[PDB]
Amino acid sequence: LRVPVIDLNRVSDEEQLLPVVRAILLQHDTFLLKNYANKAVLDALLAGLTTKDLPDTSQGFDANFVWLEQYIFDTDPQLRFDRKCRNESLCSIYSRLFKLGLFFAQLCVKSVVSSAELQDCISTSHYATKLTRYFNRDYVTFLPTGVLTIFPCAKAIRYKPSTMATTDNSWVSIDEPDCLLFHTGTLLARWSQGMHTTSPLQIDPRANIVSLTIWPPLTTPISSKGEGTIANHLLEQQIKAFPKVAQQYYPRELSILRLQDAMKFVKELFTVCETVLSLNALSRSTGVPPELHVLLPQISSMMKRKIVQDDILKLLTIWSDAYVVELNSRGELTMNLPKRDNLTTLTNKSRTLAFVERAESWYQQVI
Amino acid sequence: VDDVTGEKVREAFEQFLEDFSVQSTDTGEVEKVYRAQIEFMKIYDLNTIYIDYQHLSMRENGALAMAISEQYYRFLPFLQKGLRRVVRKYAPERVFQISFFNLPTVHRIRDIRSEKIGSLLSISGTVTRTSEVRPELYKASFTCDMCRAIVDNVEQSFKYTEPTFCPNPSCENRAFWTLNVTRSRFLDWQKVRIQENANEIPTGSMPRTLDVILRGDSVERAKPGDRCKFTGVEIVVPKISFLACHVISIG
Structure with a gap:
């Protein structure tokens, strides 16, 4: 609820706010911008509604079914990128929000190691924006694909369970009237020394999420950890990997060569499953015979996603030497611990690292 | 002997x-x-x-x-x-x-004498009222006044007891040890009401009822208002109560 509120009538000369903005992103990384001159162009979002005439092929509107036209707006002078829709009122708000984005870029990416490379949208004009028009269960967690993204919205906030801002692992939501929300991408979280976060999005009352990203170059030299993988290819793989793709050959090839890396939703099961069986070991001097009907809602309450026997079968397929698959006389699957002690945290850390290494070897040999 | x-x-x-x-x-x-x-x-x-x-x-x-x-x-x-x-x-x-x-x-409630005190008995009848289960102290862990030593004290199902001598000869006092609940096993203790059956009441007599105690896992099995048959030991309460170990839904 504590969001920083600033005025816009005195930051027009750009000489009093840079230090404060740099200081304020150490704890709060969702910015709110008010009182601009867009009080008569912002309510003119009723022009681009019913076009529906061209296919996707990674440019323009991915028109998926009368309910969604996601315009992945490509840039104009870069190679392999050419996209021009009508969008007159959206061109006016794109010009004002792009000047607002370059204004925020010049006032906040100057406090890092490079203050001329990250704003390289001024020269080559590298922009691939997300005009997600939800016109007349929802989509996955969307972080901004650029390095800085300012957007008009209704509420625009949620929180997935992880170690990030508002760390209480619950979906938090605040409502904001007549303003803009700023969120930065993941490449600026690696550029700045760990001061950013992520934020999930969904169907808001102002459903047209016009995400205008900065979108760094095709050949921008990122440091040592990302020298081989450019910003364009990695973020384009993320752009083509989150929604459904059924138009052409290459992003479907990227989806069948990249969506089999979903071991993090099952190997994290291995970061918590032994804990609960050990919790059953320090409380039931019954020799720990477990029942599937009592171990299933325990891990289903520990993890919000669906947990059924396919994960148990996948864990049996990847690591069979640490568990049993022996059935009893009644007809159900039983599984116990082969350790003679209750649990040792060093051996548990070694077993978790060996499970991670075995799944990584399976990911290397499956492709 | x-x-x-x-x-x-x-x-x-x-x-x-x-x-x-x-x-x-x-x-x-x-x-x-x-x-x-x-x-x-x-x-x-x-x-x-x-x-x-x-x-x-x-x-x-x-x-x-x-x-x-x-x-x-x-x-x-x-x-x-x-x-x-x-x-x-x-x-x-x-x-x-x-x-x-x-x-x-099968013995009735009217044939109970004082010659069977401490012996086993089969009592049949009907349950009138029930008491919600409560923990039975059974055995407690007493700590000394100076030794801070643990003593595993066994109750005798009468009333809150207290030791007499400290086992470690570091002290020989008789002042108030303090009770401890960690190392003291607890068993659910229920007290229900059994009464004389309607087919074996004497002519003009009253259907005399009595309270029977029950421990272990024999509790939460006896349903209210059902003819029941208990098997237990006649234990006196400072009144002649009963302790049952077996429950069955006869009739």
Whole structure:
């Protein structure tokens, strides 16, 4: 609820706010911008509604079914990128929000190691924006694909369970009237020394999420950890990997060569499953015979996603030497611990690292 | 006089439990099922066994059953120690409950005299009221005034007791030890109301009711307002109450 509120009538000369903005992103990384001159162009979002005439092929509107036209707006002078829709009122708000984005870029990416490379949208004009028009269960967690993204919205906030801002692992939501929300991408979280976060999005009352990203170059030299993988290819793989793709050959090839890396939703099961069986070991001097009907809602309450026997079968397929698959006389699957002690945290850390290494070897040999 | 008789009756009870295995294939000869019953409860560790009195009445021409039958409260820790020794030798947080059932004689509530105090009895009737289960202190962990030493004190089902001497000769005081609940096993304790059946009431008499206590896992089985038959020990309460170990829904 504590969001920083600033005025816009005195930051027009750009000489009093840079230090404060740099200081304020150490704890709060969702910015709110008010009182601009867009009080008569912002309510003119009723022009681009019913076009529906061209296919996707990674440019323009991915028109998926009368309910969604996601315009992945490509840039104009870069190679392999050419996209021009009508969008007159959206061109006016794109010009004002792009000047607002370059204004925020010049006032906040100057406090890092490079203050001329990250704003390289001024020269080559590298922009691939997300005009997600939800016109007349929802989509996955969307972080901004650029390095800085300012957007008009209704509420625009949620929180997935992880170690990030508002760390209480619950979906938090605040409502904001007549303003803009700023969120930065993941490449600026690696550029700045760990001061950013992520934020999930969904169907808001102002459903047209016009995400205008900065979108760094095709050949921008990122440091040592990302020298081989450019910003364009990695973020384009993320752009083509989150929604459904059924138009052409290459992003479907990227989806069948990249969506089999979903071991993090099952190997994290291995970061918590032994804990609960050990919790059953320090409380039931019954020799720990477990029942599937009592171990299933325990891990289903520990993890919000669906947990059924396919994960148990996948864990049996990847690591069979640490568990049993022996059935009893009644007809159900039983599984116990082969350790003679209750649990040792060093051996548990070694077993978790060996499970991670075995799944990584399976990911290397499956492709 | 029962200090040397208790070890002999403990040896007789463990010989009864040790000499009888299972040879019950093809409905041939009979032998008792107790070792497989202990082997079945090894996984679940409830230890709330059921021993038939009709199956115990064949040894020593019934004389072992008649001697246990009158001195049941004086022979009960020897019986549980013999049961503990046979499960300690046949198998590797320890509570025990020995229940007796199927008596050949059914006694009413009007034929209870003071000659059967401490003996076992079969009481049949109807349940009038029930009391919600509450923890029974059973045994507590007392700490000393200066030693801070743990003492495992065994209650005698009468009232809040207190030790007399500290075992460690670091002190010999008799002041107030303090109670401790960590190392003190607790058993659910219920108190229900049994009353005389409508078909065996005398002419002009009143259907006299009585309160019966119950522990172990014999609680939460007796349904209210149903004819019930209990098997237990007559224990006095400072009033003549009862302790049941077996519950059944007769009628």
